[PDB]
Coordinates of C-alpha atoms (C1' of nucleotides) and ligand atoms in Angstrom, one line a residue:
Chain R
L1 CA 104.5 111.6 110.4
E2 CA 102.1 114.4 109.4
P3 CA 98.4 113.3 109.4
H4 CA 97.8 113.5 105.7
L5 CA 100.8 111.2 105.1
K6 CA 99.5 108.8 107.8
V7 CA 96.2 108.7 106.0
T8 CA 98.0 108.2 102.6
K9 CA 100.0 105.3 104.1
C10 CA 97.0 103.6 105.7
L11 CA 95.1 103.8 102.3
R12 CA 98.2 102.3 100.5
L13 CA 98.3 99.5 103.0
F14 CA 94.6 98.8 102.5
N15 CA 95.0 98.9 98.7
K16 CA 97.8 96.3 99.0
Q17 CA 95.6 94.0 101.1
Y18 CA 92.6 94.5 98.7
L19 CA 94.6 93.6 95.6
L20 CA 96.1 90.5 97.4
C21 CA 92.5 89.4 98.2
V22 CA 91.5 90.0 94.6
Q23 CA 94.4 87.8 93.5
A24 CA 93.5 85.2 96.0
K25 CA 90.0 85.3 94.3
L26 CA 88.2 85.7 97.7
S27 CA 84.7 87.0 97.8
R28 CA 84.2 90.7 98.6
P29 CA 88.0 91.3 98.6
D30 CA 87.2 94.8 99.6
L31 CA 85.8 93.6 102.9
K32 CA 88.5 90.9 103.2
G33 CA 91.1 93.7 103.0
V34 CA 89.5 95.5 105.9
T35 CA 89.5 92.3 107.9
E36 CA 93.2 92.0 107.2
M37 CA 93.7 95.6 108.4
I38 CA 91.8 94.8 111.6
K39 CA 93.8 91.7 112.2
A40 CA 97.0 93.7 111.8
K41 CA 95.8 96.5 114.1
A42 CA 96.3 98.8 111.2
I43 CA 93.1 100.9 111.4
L44 CA 94.4 104.4 111.6
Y45 CA 91.7 105.7 113.9
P46 CA 90.5 102.6 115.8
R47 CA 88.3 104.6 118.2
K48 CA 85.4 106.9 117.3
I49 CA 86.0 110.6 116.9
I50 CA 83.5 113.5 116.9
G51 CA 84.4 116.1 114.3
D52 CA 87.1 116.1 111.8
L53 CA 89.8 113.4 111.5
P54 CA 93.4 114.8 111.1
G55 CA 94.6 114.3 107.6
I56 CA 91.1 113.8 106.1
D57 CA 90.1 117.2 104.7
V58 CA 86.7 118.3 103.6
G59 CA 86.4 117.1 100.1
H60 CA 88.3 113.9 100.6
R61 CA 87.4 111.2 98.0
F62 CA 87.0 107.6 99.2
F63 CA 86.8 104.9 96.5
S64 CA 84.8 102.4 98.5
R65 CA 82.9 102.0 101.8
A66 CA 85.7 99.6 102.8
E67 CA 88.4 102.4 102.5
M68 CA 86.4 104.4 105.0
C69 CA 86.5 101.4 107.3
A70 CA 90.2 100.9 106.8
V71 CA 91.0 104.5 108.0
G72 CA 88.4 104.4 110.8
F73 CA 86.4 107.2 109.3
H74 CA 83.2 105.2 109.1
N75 CA 83.3 101.8 110.7
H76 CA 80.5 99.8 109.1
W77 CA 80.8 98.7 105.5
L78 CA 77.0 98.8 105.1
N79 CA 75.3 101.0 107.9
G80 CA 74.5 104.6 106.9
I81 CA 75.0 105.7 110.5
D82 CA 78.1 105.3 112.5
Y83 CA 77.9 106.1 116.3
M84 CA 79.5 105.8 119.7
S85 CA 77.8 103.1 121.6
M86 CA 77.3 103.0 125.3
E87 CA 80.9 101.8 125.6
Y88 CA 81.9 105.4 125.2
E89 CA 79.6 106.5 128.0
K90 CA 82.3 107.0 130.7
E91 CA 84.6 108.9 128.3
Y92 CA 81.9 111.4 127.3
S93 CA 80.1 111.6 130.6
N94 CA 78.7 115.0 130.0
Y95 CA 76.9 113.7 127.0
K96 CA 74.1 111.2 126.7
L97 CA 75.1 108.2 124.6
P98 CA 74.8 106.8 121.9
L99 CA 76.1 109.7 119.8
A100 CA 76.3 109.7 116.0
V101 CA 79.6 110.8 114.4
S102 CA 79.3 110.0 110.7
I103 CA 76.6 109.3 108.2
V104 CA 76.6 108.3 104.6
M105 CA 74.0 109.5 102.0
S106 CA 73.9 107.1 99.1
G107 CA 70.4 107.7 97.8
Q108 CA 69.1 104.4 99.1
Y109 CA 66.3 105.6 101.3
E110 CA 63.3 106.9 99.4
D111 CA 62.6 109.6 102.0
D112 CA 66.1 111.2 101.8
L113 CA 66.1 114.7 100.5
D114 CA 69.5 116.3 99.4
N115 CA 69.7 120.0 99.1
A116 CA 73.5 120.4 99.6
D117 CA 73.9 122.7 102.6
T118 CA 70.6 121.4 103.9
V119 CA 69.7 117.7 104.0
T120 CA 66.7 115.7 105.3
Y121 CA 68.3 112.3 106.2
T122 CA 66.1 109.4 106.9
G123 CA 66.9 107.3 110.0
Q124 CA 67.9 103.7 109.7
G125 CA 65.5 100.7 109.9
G126 CA 62.6 99.0 108.2
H127 CA 64.4 99.4 104.9
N128 CA 64.6 96.8 102.2
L129 CA 68.3 96.3 101.5
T130 CA 67.5 94.7 98.1
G131 CA 64.5 94.5 95.8
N132 CA 62.6 97.7 95.5
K133 CA 64.7 99.1 98.4
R134 CA 61.6 100.7 100.0
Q135 CA 60.4 101.0 103.6
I136 CA 58.7 97.8 104.6
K137 CA 57.9 98.5 108.3
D138 CA 58.0 101.2 110.9
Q139 CA 61.2 102.8 112.2
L140 CA 62.1 103.1 115.9
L141 CA 63.9 105.7 117.9
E142 CA 66.9 103.5 118.7
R143 CA 70.5 102.8 117.5
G144 CA 71.5 105.4 114.9
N145 CA 68.2 107.2 115.2
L146 CA 68.7 107.6 119.0
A147 CA 72.3 108.6 118.3
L148 CA 71.3 111.4 115.9
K149 CA 68.7 112.5 118.3
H150 CA 71.4 112.9 121.0
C151 CA 73.5 114.9 118.5
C152 CA 70.6 117.3 118.0
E153 CA 70.1 117.6 121.7
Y154 CA 73.8 118.3 122.5
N155 CA 74.8 120.3 119.4
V156 CA 77.3 117.5 118.4
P157 CA 78.2 117.7 114.7
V158 CA 78.1 114.7 112.3
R159 CA 80.4 114.0 109.4
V160 CA 78.4 113.7 106.2
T161 CA 79.6 111.7 103.2
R162 CA 77.9 111.4 99.8
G163 CA 78.0 108.5 97.4
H164 CA 78.3 109.6 93.7
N165 CA 77.9 107.5 90.6
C166 CA 80.9 107.6 88.3
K167 CA 80.9 107.2 84.5
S168 CA 84.5 105.9 84.6
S169 CA 86.2 103.0 83.0
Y170 CA 87.2 101.5 86.4
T171 CA 85.5 103.3 89.2
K172 CA 81.8 102.8 89.6
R173 CA 81.3 104.8 92.8
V174 CA 83.0 107.4 94.9
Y175 CA 82.3 108.7 98.4
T176 CA 83.1 112.4 99.2
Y177 CA 83.4 113.6 102.7
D178 CA 81.5 116.9 102.6
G179 CA 82.2 118.3 106.0
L180 CA 80.4 118.6 109.3
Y181 CA 76.6 119.2 109.7
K182 CA 74.5 119.8 112.8
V183 CA 71.3 118.0 113.4
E184 CA 68.9 121.0 113.5
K185 CA 65.9 118.9 114.3
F186 CA 64.2 115.6 113.9
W187 CA 60.7 114.1 114.0
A188 CA 58.7 111.1 113.1
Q189 CA 56.2 111.0 110.3
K190 CA 54.7 108.6 107.7
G191 CA 57.2 108.2 104.9
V192 CA 56.2 107.9 101.2
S193 CA 55.5 104.2 101.6
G194 CA 53.2 104.7 104.6
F195 CA 55.4 103.4 107.4
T196 CA 56.8 105.6 110.2
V197 CA 60.2 107.1 109.4
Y198 CA 62.4 109.3 111.5
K199 CA 63.7 112.3 109.7
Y200 CA 66.8 114.3 110.6
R201 CA 67.2 117.9 109.3
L202 CA 70.9 118.6 108.9
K203 CA 72.5 122.0 108.2
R204 CA 76.2 122.3 107.1
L205 CA 78.4 124.1 109.6
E206 CA 80.1 127.4 108.9
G207 CA 83.9 127.7 108.7
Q208 CA 84.4 125.1 106.0
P209 CA 85.3 125.1 102.4
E210 CA 82.3 125.8 100.1
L211 CA 80.4 122.7 98.9
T212 CA 81.5 122.3 95.3
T213 CA 79.2 121.5 92.4
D214 CA 79.9 118.9 89.6
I215 CA 88.5 124.0 74.8
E216 CA 90.3 126.7 77.0
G217 CA 93.9 127.7 76.7
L218 CA 94.5 124.9 74.2
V219 CA 97.9 125.1 72.7
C220 CA 98.2 121.7 71.1
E221 CA 95.4 119.3 70.2
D222 CA 97.6 116.3 71.0
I223 CA 101.3 116.4 72.1
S224 CA 101.7 112.8 70.9
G225 CA 101.8 112.2 67.2
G226 CA 98.4 110.7 67.3
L227 CA 100.8 108.0 68.5
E228 CA 99.2 107.5 71.9
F229 CA 96.0 105.5 71.9
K230 CA 94.4 108.4 73.7
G231 CA 95.3 111.9 72.6
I232 CA 97.1 114.2 75.1
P233 CA 96.0 117.8 74.7
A234 CA 98.2 120.6 76.1
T235 CA 97.0 123.9 77.6
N236 CA 98.6 127.1 78.7
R237 CA 96.2 129.1 80.8
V238 CA 99.1 130.8 82.6
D239 CA 100.5 132.7 79.6
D240 CA 99.3 134.4 76.6
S241 CA 102.5 133.9 74.7
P242 CA 101.4 130.3 74.2
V243 CA 104.1 128.1 72.7
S244 CA 103.5 124.4 72.9
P245 CA 105.6 121.9 74.9
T246 CA 106.3 120.0 71.7
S247 CA 108.6 122.8 70.2
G248 CA 112.2 121.5 70.2
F249 CA 110.9 118.1 71.2
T250 CA 109.7 115.0 69.2
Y251 CA 107.3 112.5 70.5
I252 CA 108.3 108.8 70.5
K253 CA 106.6 105.7 72.0
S254 CA 109.7 103.6 71.9
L255 CA 113.2 103.9 73.4
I256 CA 116.0 104.9 71.1
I257 CA 119.3 103.3 72.0
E258 CA 122.6 105.2 71.4
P259 CA 125.5 103.6 69.4
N260 CA 127.8 103.3 72.5
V261 CA 125.1 101.8 74.6
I262 CA 125.1 98.0 74.6
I263 CA 122.0 95.9 74.0
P264 CA 121.9 93.0 76.5
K265 CA 121.1 89.4 75.4
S266 CA 117.4 88.8 75.0
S267 CA 115.6 86.9 77.8
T268 CA 114.3 83.4 77.1
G269 CA 110.8 83.9 78.3
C270 CA 107.9 81.5 79.1
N271 CA 106.1 78.9 77.1
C272 CA 102.5 79.7 78.1
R273 CA 99.8 80.0 75.4
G274 CA 97.4 82.9 75.2
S275 CA 97.8 84.3 78.8
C276 CA 100.0 83.5 81.8
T277 CA 97.8 82.3 84.7
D278 CA 99.6 79.4 86.4
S279 CA 102.7 80.2 88.5
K280 CA 103.8 76.6 88.3
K281 CA 104.2 76.5 84.5
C282 CA 105.2 80.1 83.8
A283 CA 108.9 80.8 84.1
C284 CA 108.3 84.6 84.2
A285 CA 106.2 84.1 87.4
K286 CA 109.2 82.0 88.8
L287 CA 111.4 85.0 88.0
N288 CA 109.1 87.1 90.2
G289 CA 109.6 84.7 93.1
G290 CA 106.9 82.2 92.3
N291 CA 104.0 84.6 91.8
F292 CA 102.4 87.2 89.5
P293 CA 103.2 90.8 90.4
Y294 CA 100.0 92.0 88.6
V295 CA 96.4 91.2 89.3
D296 CA 93.9 91.1 86.4
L297 CA 91.7 94.0 87.5
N298 CA 90.9 97.2 85.7
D299 CA 93.1 96.0 82.8
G300 CA 96.0 95.1 85.2
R301 CA 97.2 96.6 88.5
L302 CA 100.6 96.2 90.2
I303 CA 99.9 94.6 93.7
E304 CA 102.9 96.3 95.3
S305 CA 106.3 97.8 94.6
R306 CA 109.3 95.6 94.2
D307 CA 113.1 95.9 93.4
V308 CA 112.2 94.7 90.0
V309 CA 109.2 93.3 88.1
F310 CA 109.7 90.6 85.5
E311 CA 107.3 90.9 82.7
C312 CA 106.7 88.6 79.8
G313 CA 108.7 89.6 76.7
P314 CA 109.3 89.2 73.0
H315 CA 110.0 85.4 73.2
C316 CA 107.1 84.5 75.5
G317 CA 104.4 82.3 74.0
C318 CA 101.7 84.5 75.4
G319 CA 99.8 87.2 73.5
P320 CA 99.7 90.9 74.3
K321 CA 96.7 90.5 76.6
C322 CA 98.8 88.7 79.2
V323 CA 98.4 90.3 82.6
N324 CA 102.2 89.9 83.0
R325 CA 102.6 92.4 80.2
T326 CA 100.6 95.1 82.2
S327 CA 103.0 98.0 81.6
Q328 CA 103.4 97.3 77.9
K329 CA 99.7 98.0 77.2
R330 CA 98.3 101.2 75.6
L331 CA 97.7 104.4 77.5
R332 CA 94.6 103.7 79.5
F333 CA 93.7 107.3 80.6
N334 CA 92.8 110.6 79.2
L335 CA 95.6 113.0 80.3
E336 CA 96.4 116.6 79.8
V337 CA 99.7 118.5 79.8
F338 CA 99.2 122.0 81.3
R339 CA 101.3 125.1 82.1
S340 CA 101.8 125.4 85.8
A341 CA 102.5 128.7 87.7
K342 CA 106.2 128.1 88.2
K343 CA 107.1 124.4 87.5
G344 CA 106.6 124.9 83.8
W345 CA 104.8 121.9 82.2
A346 CA 102.8 119.5 84.3
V347 CA 100.5 116.5 83.7
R348 CA 97.1 115.7 85.1
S349 CA 94.3 113.1 84.5
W350 CA 90.8 113.7 83.4
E351 CA 89.6 110.4 84.9
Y352 CA 90.1 108.2 87.9
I353 CA 93.3 106.3 88.2
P354 CA 93.2 103.2 90.5
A355 CA 96.3 102.5 92.7
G356 CA 98.6 100.1 91.0
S357 CA 97.6 101.1 87.5
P358 CA 100.5 101.8 85.1
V359 CA 100.7 105.4 84.0
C360 CA 103.7 105.3 81.6
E361 CA 107.2 104.1 80.8
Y362 CA 109.8 106.8 80.9
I363 CA 110.7 106.9 77.2
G364 CA 113.6 108.9 75.7
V365 CA 117.1 108.2 74.2
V366 CA 119.1 105.7 76.3
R367 CA 122.6 107.1 76.7
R368 CA 125.7 106.3 78.7
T369 CA 125.7 108.6 81.8
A370 CA 129.4 109.5 81.2
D371 CA 128.5 110.8 77.7
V372 CA 126.1 113.4 79.3
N373 CA 119.9 118.7 81.7
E374 CA 116.5 118.6 83.3
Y375 CA 115.0 115.6 81.6
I376 CA 117.5 112.9 82.3
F377 CA 116.3 109.8 84.3
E378 CA 119.2 107.7 85.7
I379 CA 118.5 104.0 85.7
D380 CA 119.3 102.4 89.1
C381 CA 117.7 99.3 90.5
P382 CA 124.7 104.4 87.4
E383 CA 126.1 103.5 83.9
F384 CA 123.0 104.3 81.9
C385 CA 120.2 106.9 81.7
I386 CA 117.2 107.9 79.7
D387 CA 117.6 111.3 78.0
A388 CA 114.2 112.8 77.2
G389 CA 115.8 116.2 76.5
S390 CA 114.8 116.3 72.8
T391 CA 112.7 113.3 72.2
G392 CA 110.5 111.0 74.4
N393 CA 107.0 110.2 75.4
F394 CA 104.8 112.3 77.8
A395 CA 106.6 111.0 81.0
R396 CA 109.1 113.8 80.8
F397 CA 106.4 116.4 81.5
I398 CA 105.6 114.9 84.9
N399 CA 106.8 117.1 87.8
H400 CA 108.4 116.3 91.1
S401 CA 106.6 116.4 94.5
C402 CA 107.6 115.7 98.0
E403 CA 104.3 114.0 98.5
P404 CA 103.9 112.1 95.2
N405 CA 100.9 110.1 93.9
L406 CA 103.1 108.1 91.5
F407 CA 106.1 105.9 92.1
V408 CA 108.9 104.5 89.9
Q409 CA 109.0 100.8 89.3
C410 CA 111.9 99.0 87.5
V411 CA 110.7 96.5 85.0
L412 CA 112.6 93.8 82.9
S413 CA 110.9 92.2 80.0
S414 CA 113.1 92.1 76.9
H415 CA 116.3 91.4 78.8
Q416 CA 117.7 90.7 82.3
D417 CA 120.2 93.6 82.6
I418 CA 119.1 95.6 85.6
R419 CA 121.4 98.4 84.4
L420 CA 119.1 98.9 81.4
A421 CA 115.7 98.2 83.1
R422 CA 112.6 99.8 81.8
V423 CA 111.5 102.6 84.1
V424 CA 107.7 102.7 84.6
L425 CA 105.5 105.1 86.5
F426 CA 102.7 103.5 88.5
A427 CA 99.9 105.1 90.5
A428 CA 100.8 104.9 94.2
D429 CA 97.3 106.1 95.2
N430 CA 93.8 106.3 93.9
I431 CA 94.0 109.5 91.9
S432 CA 91.0 111.8 91.2
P433 CA 90.4 113.8 88.0
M434 CA 92.4 117.0 87.6
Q435 CA 94.9 116.0 90.3
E436 CA 98.5 116.7 89.0
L437 CA 100.5 113.5 88.6
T438 CA 103.8 113.6 90.4
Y439 CA 106.6 111.4 91.7
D440 CA 109.6 112.0 94.0
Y441 CA 112.8 112.7 92.0
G442 CA 114.8 111.9 95.1
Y443 CA 117.8 114.1 94.6
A444 CA 119.7 114.3 97.8
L445 CA 120.2 117.7 99.4
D446 CA 123.3 119.6 98.1
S447 CA 123.8 117.1 95.3
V448 CA 125.1 119.4 92.5
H449 CA 128.3 121.3 92.6
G450 CA 129.7 124.0 90.3
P451 CA 132.0 123.3 91.7
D452 CA 134.0 126.0 93.4
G453 CA 132.6 123.8 96.1
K454 CA 129.7 126.1 95.5
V455 CA 126.4 124.3 95.9
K456 CA 124.1 124.7 93.0
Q457 CA 120.5 124.6 94.3
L458 CA 117.0 124.4 93.0
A459 CA 113.9 125.6 94.9
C460 CA 110.9 123.2 95.1
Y461 CA 107.4 124.3 94.6
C462 CA 105.4 121.1 94.9
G463 CA 103.3 123.0 97.4
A464 CA 103.3 120.0 99.7
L465 CA 102.8 120.7 103.4
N466 CA 106.2 119.0 104.2
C467 CA 108.1 120.3 101.2
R468 CA 111.8 120.4 102.4
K469 CA 111.9 123.3 100.0
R470 CA 114.6 122.0 97.7
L471 CA 114.8 119.8 94.6
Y472 CA 118.5 119.6 95.4
Chain Q
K1 CA 115.0 111.9 88.8
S2 CA 116.9 108.8 89.8
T3 CA 115.8 107.2 93.0
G4 CA 113.3 104.4 93.7
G5 CA 112.7 100.9 95.0
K6 CA 110.8 98.7 97.3
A7 CA 112.1 95.1 97.6
Chain S
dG1 C1' 77.2 83.6 124.3
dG2 C1' 73.8 84.8 120.4
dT3 C1' 71.9 87.1 116.6
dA4 C1' 69.1 91.1 114.4
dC5 C1' 70.8 94.5 112.0
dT6 C1' 72.6 96.6 107.9
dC7 C1' 72.4 104.0 102.7
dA8 C1' 77.3 97.4 99.3
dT9 C1' 79.2 95.1 96.0
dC10 C1' 79.7 91.9 92.3
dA11 C1' 78.7 88.3 89.2
Chain E
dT1 C1' 69.0 92.5 88.9
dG2 C1' 69.9 88.5 94.1
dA3 C1' 72.9 86.6 97.8
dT4 C1' 76.1 87.2 100.3
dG5 C1' 78.7 89.9 103.5
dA6 C1' 81.0 90.6 108.7
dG7 C1' 81.4 93.3 112.7
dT8 C1' 79.0 95.2 116.0
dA9 C1' 75.8 96.5 119.7
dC10 C1' 73.1 95.2 122.8
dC11 C1' 70.4 91.6 124.5
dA12 C1' 70.3 87.7 127.1
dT13 C1' 64.3 82.7 124.2
Ligands
SAH501 N1 108.3 120.7 92.3 C1 108.9 121.6 91.5 N2 109.1 122.9 91.8 C2 109.8 123.8 90.9 N3 110.2 123.3 89.7 C3 110.0 122.0 89.4 C4 109.3 121.1 90.2 N4 109.3 119.9 89.6 C5 109.8 120.0 88.4 N5 110.2 121.3 88.2 C6 110.9 121.8 87.0 O1 110.8 120.9 86.0 C7 112.0 120.3 85.7 C8 111.8 118.8 85.7 S1 111.2 118.2 84.0 C9 109.5 118.3 84.5 C10 108.7 119.1 83.4 C11 108.8 120.6 83.5 N6 107.8 121.2 84.3 C12 108.8 121.2 82.1 O2 108.4 122.4 81.9 O3 109.3 120.6 81.1 C13 113.0 120.7 86.7 O4 114.3 121.0 86.1 C14 112.4 121.9 87.4 O5 112.9 123.1 86.8
ZN502 ZN1 102.7 86.1 79.6
ZN503 ZN1 104.0 82.5 81.1
ZN504 ZN1 106.5 85.1 79.9
ZN505 ZN1 108.5 120.2 97.6

DNA sequence: GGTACTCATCA
DNA sequence: TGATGAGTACCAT
């Protein structure tokens, strides 16, 4: 309903289409995804907008030019300048069209000069897309150049987005929306290559969050035993009085099954060699409905949520590299546990997490529900639960949010008993560094009773704009 | 932390 | 109807 | 590091 959630949803839909196109092995699956969105009339803002788009805050990180197209934020996958054409003339009759609404600075034009609050942005045209990427003929005062000129003449602000190189395992580039700028002035001159360029001097508008530039409180060098492939440091910056989250808790990477919990019969598995690629041969694919739920991208990404995912298991002929073993693989990301202000322990990531990437299985002691605090995950896809009260992996440190960036996916691999499914946290969204990882616990309101009939309640502090204010 | 699920 | 244009993306 | 890539924007050899 609320604009941020509408944006979130639109971006999830685009991610789904993208990964489907990657799986279908199409060229430029990023662009194909957008084409799918256009076909489905699923572009969130299908008409041009001057100023801010609801739900896209200053600082918003886009993970591709295509994502910007999918939301309607910037409608060309290539062009630096997006503008209202003469089609908008009647709607904006007090302005002269064309009018620019959004530009992208990606450091591709040799005459661009970036000074943060102040920018000198080269017009479009006469630019080599490839090779040396230099100017190769004169520019003209038309199209985007004319559009920016009209912006200057009418005091119409332009959204400005910067490309940034990333040294990340999976994300090469990111685009940050940096707020509105005015076109202060513009002129023509010879560029550094000797051809005419138009130059647009832009000044960031007041009233916006400051442009941002880009070991402390350490309590534990690694909450895992050295067990996780990547260490998980813990910090308390909130309290002197710095006990570590591991106290009273022992880290395990594997489920422990209680005596009174029954171990289901093992699944038969598939007969593929090496890796499972063909949905015809592979029985595990057949279990998934005739298709692989994971795509082989960035070490494996879930295409979309399901009632249950059927992974290759102990008896499958495939080795550990199989893409249908995606959630079984080692921790892919550098994470941190940190003391929050009033949720206690929290987890965040130090690197980018692509949507569909596994974050972790919820590991603990599998107990019968009848035989049983805060760290119990009921398995429902309820007879059984995972008790991470005293022992488990890092999953138990992940907080609830009413607007989560993770989701829970039931996975079967070693057996076919949905009662005892593996519980795996996957990224629902593309996640940026230092963003807290959260999922929706989904306790129904007024769930726990004392009971004198008295409703025992817990206040929620996810800070989300649509918080419903209660865990239960 | 129970609920989930997306056929 | 036709097509020049285009601050990506990836092997 | 080349070769595509696709949706328009405006023209209408
Ligand atoms: N959104 C939220 N607001 C307030 N407390 C929260 C919360 N999400 C989780 N918690 C707290 O964390 C517990 C879930 S276990 C999550 C880890 C916890 N922060 C810890 O320190 O170990 C809940 O019982 C609740 O007390
Ligand atoms: Zn396999
Ligand atoms: Zn197989
Ligand atoms: Zn298998
Ligand atoms: Zn909340």
